[PDB]
Amino acid sequence: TSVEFWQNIASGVGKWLRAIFAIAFWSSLILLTFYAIMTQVAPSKVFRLGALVDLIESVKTVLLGIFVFTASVTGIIAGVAAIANAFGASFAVSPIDVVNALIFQPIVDMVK
Amino acid sequence: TSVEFWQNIASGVGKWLRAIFAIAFWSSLILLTFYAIMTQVAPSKVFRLGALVDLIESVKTVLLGIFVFTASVTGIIAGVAAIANAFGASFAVSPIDVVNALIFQPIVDMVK
Amino acid sequence: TSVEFWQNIASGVGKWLRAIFAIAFWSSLILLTFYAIMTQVAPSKVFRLGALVDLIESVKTVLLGIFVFTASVTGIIAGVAAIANAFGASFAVSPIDVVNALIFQPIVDMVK
Amino acid sequence: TSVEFWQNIASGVGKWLRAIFAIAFWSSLILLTFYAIMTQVAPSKVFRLGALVDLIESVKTVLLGIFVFTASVTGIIAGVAAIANAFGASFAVSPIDVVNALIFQPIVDMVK
Amino acid sequence: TSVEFWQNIASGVGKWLRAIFAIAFWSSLILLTFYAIMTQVAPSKVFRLGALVDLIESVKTVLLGIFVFTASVTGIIAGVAAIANAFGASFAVSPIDVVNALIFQPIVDMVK
Amino acid sequence: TSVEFWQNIASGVGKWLRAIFAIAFWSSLILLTFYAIMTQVAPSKVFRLGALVDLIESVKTVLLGIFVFTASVTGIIAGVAAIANAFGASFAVSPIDVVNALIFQPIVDMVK
Amino acid sequence: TSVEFWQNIASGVGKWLRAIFAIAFWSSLILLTFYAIMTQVAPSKVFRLGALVDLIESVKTVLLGIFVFTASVTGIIAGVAAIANAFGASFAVSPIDVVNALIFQPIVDMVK
Amino acid sequence: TSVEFWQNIASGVGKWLRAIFAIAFWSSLILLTFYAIMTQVAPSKVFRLGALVDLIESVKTVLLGIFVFTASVTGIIAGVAAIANAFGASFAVSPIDVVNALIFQPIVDMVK
Amino acid sequence: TSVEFWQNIASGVGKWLRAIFAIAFWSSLILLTFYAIMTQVAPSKVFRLGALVDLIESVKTVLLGIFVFTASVTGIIAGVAAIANAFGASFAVSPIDVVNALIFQPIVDMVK
Amino acid sequence: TSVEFWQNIASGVGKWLRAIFAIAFWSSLILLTFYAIMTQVAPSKVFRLGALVDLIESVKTVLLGIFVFTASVTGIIAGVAAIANAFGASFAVSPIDVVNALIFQPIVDMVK
């Protein structure tokens, strides 16, 4: 119906999504903690060993997911910036600012 | 539904998990004590010897579990900090503070 | 063919599904009991230990499933209620009543 | 096919399982008795000593199993009761009644 | 190409499948026997104990599989019979006859 | 490929397994005899005492294994017979005949 | 690109696979030998007993694998031969020759 | 990479394993000799008696291990030979030659 | 707009794609290395075994992918060359040069 | 974004992985040393015997893992080299250099 309506809805959903993404990262951390208490308390050696293995699995998968997310954001922004070339068009969007704000800004300002 | 709802639930579950993790560490200590009384009271020499061996087993496994937990936390935090590089992004999260608060802060403030 | 026909079929299948869901929850409880007798009777220590571990696995998975179900119901109802906004539409559905009736009402009125 | 069919089958299997669980507990008691006669009759001192040790092993493992069972039942019921909160839902199930009926009611009414 | 061709092929494959299903049930029985001789001959106590545990595992899994099969057959036949209702259609198929012939008829007429 | 092929292979392996099971039982008997000659010839008192203890161990473990085997066979056959109920299905398999033929028939017809 | 090219590549990979399969069978034999020396040299009785048990495990699993392989080959060839029927088609492939050449021909011509 | 490479590696490891197995058998013999000198020199009667008992233990365990090894080799070879039947396949491997070469050929050609 | 514009863009994207394909192959190699360290460090035997299995999985899938890629390139080039026939048209493109340059040229000139 | 960026990241992760792999091998050596001190200090004979057995287990598993790693690397490189054939393509990669640099070069230059 009107432009600022869509602007407001997009901004709201964006902030909600980045907030819940930070919550998701810290939930991965708490799941790391849960596997820690599991390997601390599990009676048999084999269960503690399996808890250590899946702890390493969780840390590796969270790191890989973060890597893919940041790499994809940088890739899309740099691809659009480069595709502005070969045509003469100027794309001054400062990719570092957007890749910082979308990825690491919501994460940092949290205390557990 | 709302952001602070998820924030509160995550904070509550985090504090509960760290508290029960400290309880778990001190339960490992009391299990050490139980093996101590076992090797103190076991009539035959062989049973006292086995109690000593599994006492050493328990101390080694608790130390290894603590090592894996702290190493994994430091590894994930430092990996995200380093992956902030090569892209120009800034990740000022003070990894020492989080590795202290998640690992050793709940443990220290307990008296048995 | 006619409206009340579909109304009746939907109501019947809904009541059947909630009844069998309560049966499912209490079957999870009886499976907990089965693991209890397993760890009570299993001759070797290792089998009792594994029964304890999978008992904890069962309780954690049933709790997680209940959490996801209730959270999803609350999320859909609150999302529709909020999407009634930004347009002026009124959605007076009392989400608490529906999340109670769909989730906890069938469960409570059962005795094992 | 029909609701009361599943209700009857679940009730029957539940009563059978709790009865056999009480039988299991009293079988642990009779195994205690068997180790008692073993340490009473075993000719060499070492065999009587080992019978005493495994008698203590049996009593400790039965006590630990009972503890884990009752703690898990209380934990699941209290977790569902608490998860009824933060949403406004009411869960009036009287956890004490169910933890009594599932755990200690079948055990008490037996004479050996 | 022609109706009785498909009728014959379906009947043949059906009889072959039910015969091999009865063979499968009696092979589960012989596997029970193999675990019996294992726990009878295994030198160490721990191996006999594990053979007893996996013997119980095998009997429980065969019983659960038979239960799921018969329950699914009864469920599909009764569901089609009930779905004949609410429309006025008549479905006189005698579900007991089919659930007997598909499940227990091939099994009974075998001697090991 | 064909039904009677599988029938013949199953019957052959079944008879072989029951024959070797009877051989296993009588080998348990000969091991009892070996412990008897050990406690008869062992020079020191302690070795004769230990031979008596492990003789009792062998007899108790063979009796327990036989008990578990026969109880499991009776349990599976009676469970299938009872699960034929609640559905109307008839399961006329004469459980006593099968529990006799699988358990005690191969054992009896042997002379040592 | 051309027919005999694919013919040659398929023949080469087939001969390589059957040769390495024969190598695999004889490696199972050498693993049997390794468990033999383990149970011959293992100092404690329990380790020799476990080596005997896993030796039996290895022989049973190799025999079961060979059985499944030969049964599957015979089953596929006989199924295609039978499916040539009911349509009038002739399938003169001599299943015995192929089941011999694929299974036992590479194995026999080896000396360890 | 190539067939004769795997052939050579398998042959080499096989010869090494059979040689060390013969060394193991003769080491069992030298351990018999060590128990002989122990019972010859042990001052107290009880220690000589215990040395005699564990000497008998060693001879019985070496004989049992050799029996299990040769029986397992004969069993696997005869099982594959018999499983060649019921399918028409020919398995001309001369089981006696392989059971001789794998078991007794390395042992005989040694002088202590 | 102009021919050499499209020529330049196609050449640039082609070189970028072949470079990242070589990077992908060497990343498959480093993933092989990661599974190697996993099976080297994994505490329990089962985890090392699974790491070996998925290591073999990775090598087989990389080899199959390379095979499909090179076979598809050769197939398309040879198909166009052959379709030049039956019409009299000449297609002198030297398929070996293109299948070398597109497949193996980017891979070889890399050092890890 | 750019080629040398991916080149640098791949080279860095490769060197890090090979360094930590060498660390892993020497950690296997130190674990061998730990089992050595265990069997040196363990009071009862049975514990020293078990330490010897698991010492042999550790050496065998490290040797098997190294074998699988080097064999897989040689296999993939030789498979790609051979698949360069049958198409005319040239693959001059010197497999010996890569199998040396990826496997043994990081290991050798370490002093413990």
Topology, number of strands of chain A: 0
Q: Which series of helices and strands of chain A comes N to C?
A: HHHH
Characterize the main sheet of chain A: none
> Regarding quaternary structure, how should these chains be classified?
part of a larger assembly
Largest interface by Cβ-Cβ < 8 Å: A-B, 36 and 39 residues
Continuous helix count of chain A: 4
Question: Portion of residues in helices of chain A?
Answer: over 70%
Beta content of chain A? under 5%
Radius of gyration of chain A: 20 Å
Task: State the distance separating the first and last CA atoms of chain A.
Answer: 42 Å
Shape of chain A: elongated
Structural class of chain A: mainly alpha
Provide an overview of this structure.
This is part of a larger assembly, with 10 copies of chain A (112 residues). The first copy, chain A, has helices at residues 3-41, 45-83, 95-103, 105-108. In chain A, helix 1 runs antiparallel to helix 2 (45-83). Chain A has 112 residues and is mainly α. Chain A is elongated. The longest helix of chain A has 39 residues, at 3-41. Helix content of chain A is 81%, strand content 0%. Chains in contact: A-B, A-C, A-I, B-D, B-J, C-D, C-E, D-F, E-F, E-G, F-H, G-H, G-J, I-J. The A-B interface holds A 16, 19-20, 23, 26-27, 29-30, 32-34, 36-37, 39-41, 45, 48, 52, 55-56, 59, 62-63, 66-67, 70, 74, 96, 99-100, 103-104, 107-108, 112 and B 3, 6-7, 10-11, 13-14, 17-18, 20-21, 24-25, 27-28, 61-62, 65-66, 68-69, 72-73, 75-76, 79-80, 83-84, 87-93, 98, 101-102.
Any chance you could write out the topology, listing elements then pairs?
This is part of a larger assembly, with ten copies of chain A (112 residues).
Chain A: H1 3-41, H2 45-83, H3 95-103, H4 105-108
PDB class: protein fibril
Keywords: archaeal conjugative pilus, protein fibril
Entry title: Cryo-EM structure of conjugative pili from Pyrobaculum calidifontis
